[PDB]
Design an enzyme around this catalytic site. Structure first.
Site, PDB file in Angstrom:
ATOM      1  N   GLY A   1      21.967   1.015  34.413  1.00 39.54           N
ATOM      2  CA  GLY A   1      22.866   2.112  34.993  1.00 39.54           C
ATOM      3  C   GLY A   1      22.773   2.968  33.779  1.00 39.54           C
ATOM      4  O   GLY A   1      21.625   3.349  33.216  1.00 39.54           O
ATOM      5  N   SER A   2      23.944   3.773  33.576  1.00 38.29           N
ATOM      6  CA  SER A   2      24.094   4.860  32.802  1.00 38.29           C
ATOM      7  C   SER A   2      23.816   4.707  31.298  1.00 38.29           C
ATOM      8  O   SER A   2      23.910   5.691  30.650  1.00 38.29           O
ATOM      9  CB  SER A   2      25.353   5.595  32.839  1.00 38.29           C
ATOM     10  OG  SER A   2      25.636   5.794  34.611  1.00 38.29           O
ATOM     11  N   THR A   3      23.764   3.307  30.737  1.00 42.42           N
ATOM     12  CA  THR A   3      23.455   2.985  29.441  1.00 42.42           C
ATOM     13  C   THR A   3      22.114   3.695  28.980  1.00 42.42           C
ATOM     14  O   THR A   3      21.828   3.608  27.761  1.00 42.42           O
ATOM     15  CB  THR A   3      23.651   1.747  29.147  1.00 42.42           C
ATOM     16  OG1 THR A   3      22.731   0.826  29.678  1.00 42.42           O
ATOM     17  CG2 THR A   3      25.051   1.148  29.399  1.00 42.42           C
ATOM     18  N   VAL A   4      21.247   4.013  30.025  1.00 44.33           N
ATOM     19  CA  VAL A   4      19.990   4.505  29.647  1.00 44.33           C
ATOM     20  C   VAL A   4      19.816   5.984  29.669  1.00 44.33           C
ATOM     21  O   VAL A   4      18.897   6.383  29.431  1.00 44.33           O
ATOM     22  CB  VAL A   4      18.689   4.081  30.590  1.00 44.33           C
ATOM     23  CG1 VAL A   4      18.831   2.387  30.566  1.00 44.33           C
ATOM     24  CG2 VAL A   4      18.888   4.497  31.963  1.00 44.33           C
ATOM     25  N   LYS A   5      20.841   6.740  29.923  1.00 42.42           N
ATOM     26  CA  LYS A   5      20.814   8.118  29.971  1.00 42.42           C
ATOM     27  C   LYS A   5      20.580   8.715  28.576  1.00 42.42           C
ATOM     28  O   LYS A   5      19.843   9.783  28.445  1.00 42.42           O
ATOM     29  CB  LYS A   5      22.215   8.704  30.288  1.00 42.42           C
ATOM     30  CG  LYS A   5      22.360   8.515  31.935  1.00 42.42           C
ATOM     31  CD  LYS A   5      23.911   8.936  32.517  1.00 42.42           C
ATOM     32  CE  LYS A   5      23.847   8.823  33.854  1.00 42.42           C
ATOM     33  NZ  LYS A   5      25.264   9.240  34.374  1.00 42.42           N
TER      34      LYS A   5
END
Ligand SMILES: [Cl-]
Length: 500
Positions: free
Chosen positions: A243-247
């Site tokens: 999810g958003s932890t790879v942004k």
């Protein structure tokens, strides 16, 4: 009447933590066996011996009668020395005493998933015990014994070859950090009604896994009634969409492209974006123009998707692959999963957008932490290690030092700026990180970060599976765990405060 060569068990090597605390210790235990050929000549002794073994008279007698031809059977393995002498004092013919080795695990459930366990034959079957089995097991010896025609061990001749003891093994884990992480992950699960979780701590300069804890866990010293779900080292064998932890990595590809700087602006109104039948949707939808730091602070999927359309998914795939997401870690841990970072000849728009905010790929907690370590370490990836690292091997530059530096600064704002993830703030230090909330109507709450932001030493990943309270956002559920464990870890490693 019969000369025979029999094995001499070798002493299995001690496992310690990085500072020498014992984690797995070979301890002497007393095992009793018997030669039924000899027992058959002293039947009047059986009931007293049976009672001594906690056994029903008849069942014991049935057992010995059935094996009357064999020359060896176990009676009971792993007793206290006082217990074995209690039986031998009966002087029952054909009853014998032996000392074996049995592992004891002083930290029990606190480090079970990493250390693993041995079987009753002292062979490594799980975790580090299995992975490093050849190093830990040594080499059995051999000795020569005479046995009369009935199995009686008449004489004891010489030793043909001495046993070679196993070698000590010091892990990268810091037992003090491991206890703290274990306690706080557990507390977070109970406070949130969650089902499972993982926490990984890594030294961004050396590659060392300083702590690796999961829930549920089990006591390896008493494995009766063990639930196999309690035995999973989820940090290494479970895969999930990050999810958003790879942004931050999408952002690294953007800043390396030549086409974006942090003050550049993206228009995300009205908080959704149609890609064909698919609809991208932001968690808060009262934004129009946002700068690149604002996209991370607000965790706007529309923002990162429009950035991804500009630079192309290929450049995002490349950064993610270079930092190790969905790639083989090379640790050789039993059951360790690789996950999957998909690829395409030409990336469709919908796949491009979801990749940029962490759907469509599968990673493990250890890969996510290693990727954040590379980012914290000014863009240089140092090889992962489960053992103490004395001579650090050379790392690989996977993100340019200027880009990694810029992304570090943005992630410090994610934690510190107004509207940010204030619960991840670490007293006395500057911290940087990104939250995540990923589907699995059930979610995983995630937080990944590093500290001190001014000079990073430690990267940490917190994954909490299915929180059941009203709040399930990574920033509400996982960020406060990061805060408590990071503070303790920095104190324990005497890292100087950069925010006093
Ligand atoms: Cl896999």
């Amino acid at each position: 009447r019969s000369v025979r060569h029999i094995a001499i068990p070798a002493h299995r090597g001690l496992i310690t933590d990085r500072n020498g605390e014992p984690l797995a210790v070979s301890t002497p235990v007393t095992t009793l066996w018997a030669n039924p050929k000899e027992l058959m000549t002293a039947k009047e002794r059986w009931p007293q011996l049976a009672a001594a073994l906690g056994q029903d008279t008849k069942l014991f007698a049935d057992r010995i009668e059935q094996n009357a031809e064999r020359e060896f059977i176990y009676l009971v393995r792993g007793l206290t020395p006082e217990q074995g002498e209690g039986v031998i004092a009966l002087k029952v013919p054909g009853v014998y005493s032996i000392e074996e080795f049995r592992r004891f695990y002083p930290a029990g459930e606190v480090v079970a998933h990493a250390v693993g366990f041995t079987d009753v034959d002292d062979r490594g079957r799980e975790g580090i015990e299995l992975a490093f089995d050849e190093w830990l097991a040594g080499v059995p010896g051999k000795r020569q014994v005479l046995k009369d025609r009935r199995g009686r061990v008449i004489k004891d001749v010489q030793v043909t070859k001495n046993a070679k003891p196993g070698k000590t093994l010091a892990l990268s884990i810091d037992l003090r950090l491991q206890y703290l992480a274990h306690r706080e992950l557990r507390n977070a699960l109970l406070e949130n009604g969650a089902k499972a979780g993982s926490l990984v701590i890594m030294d961004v300069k050396t590659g060392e896994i300083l702590a690796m804890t999961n829930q549920p866990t089990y006591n390896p010293n008493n494995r009766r009634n063990l639930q196999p779900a309690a035995m999973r080292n989820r940090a290494m064998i479970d895969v999930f969409e990050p999810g958003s932890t790879v942004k931050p990595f999408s952002m690294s590809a953007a800043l390396a492209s030549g086409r974006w700087k942090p003050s550049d602006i993206v228009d995300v109104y009205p908080g959704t974006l149609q890609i064909g039948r698919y609809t991208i949707r932001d968690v808060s939808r009262n934004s129009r123009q946002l700068d690149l730091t604002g996209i991370l602070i607000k965790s706007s999927n529309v923002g990162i998707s429009k950035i991804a359309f500009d630079i192309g998914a290929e450049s995002i795939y490349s950064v993610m692959q270079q930092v190790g997401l969905g790639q083989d870690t090379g640790l050789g841990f039993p059951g360790e999963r690789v996950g999957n970072l998909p690829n395409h000849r030409k990336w469709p728009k919908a796949e491009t957008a979801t990749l940029a905010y962490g759907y469509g790929l599968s990673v493990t907690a250890i890969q996510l932490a290693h990727a954040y370590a590379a980012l914290a370490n000014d863009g240089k990836s140092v090889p992962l290690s489960m053992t103490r690292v004395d001579r650090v091997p050379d790392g690989v530059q996977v993100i340019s030092p200027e880009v990694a530096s810029t992304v570090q600064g943005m992630l410090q704002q994610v934690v510190e700026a107004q509207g940010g993830v204030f619960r991840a703030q670490v007293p006395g230090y500057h911290a940087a990180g990104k939250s995540g909330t990923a589907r699995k109507n059930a979610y995983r709450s995630l937080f990944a970060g590093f500290a001190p932001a001014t000079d990073p030493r430690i990267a940490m990943v917190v994954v909490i599976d299915e929180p059941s309270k009203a709040g399930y956002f990574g920033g509400l559920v996982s960020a406060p765990v990061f805060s408590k464990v990071m503070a303790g870890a920095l104190r324990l490693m005497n890292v100087p405060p950069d925010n006093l």
